[PDB]
Amino acid sequence: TTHVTATGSITLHFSTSSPQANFIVSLCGKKTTCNAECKPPADHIIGEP
Amino acid sequence: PTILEVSCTVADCIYSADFGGSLTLQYKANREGHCPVHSHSTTAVLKEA
Incomplete structure (x- = not known):
């Protein structure tokens, strides 16, 4: 939840x-398609699942 | 602060060893902050970072 203003x-x-x-992001029902290009991660190991 | 959009207008410049070129950036941002500035070209460097 984000505090939303008029603009x-x-x-x-x-x-x-x-x-x-x-992937499609929805905000209060309004849908918009985000187009991006994610790089491979720089690390090799993480302490998170 | 992320910036919504930026446009560049370059003034007079002379290619030399001193910082002889100048430009102006029109920026739109979302908060007041201390963004870094860089030049991603090999053949251009900035006095301010």
Whole structure:
């Protein structure tokens, strides 16, 4: 949940498994298609699942 | 602060060893901050970062 104003912007974080972010984000029902291109990770091991 | 969009207008410049070129950036951002600036070309460097 993000506090939404009449007009403005919001920055968000996300995690993906796909090499490209080609996924629909919905905001209060309104749908928009994000097109992106995610690089391979620089690390090799993480302490998170 | 992420910036919504940026446009570049370059003034007079002379290719030399000193910082002889100048430009202006029109920026739109979402918060007041201390963004870094870089030049991604091999043949151009910035006095301010």
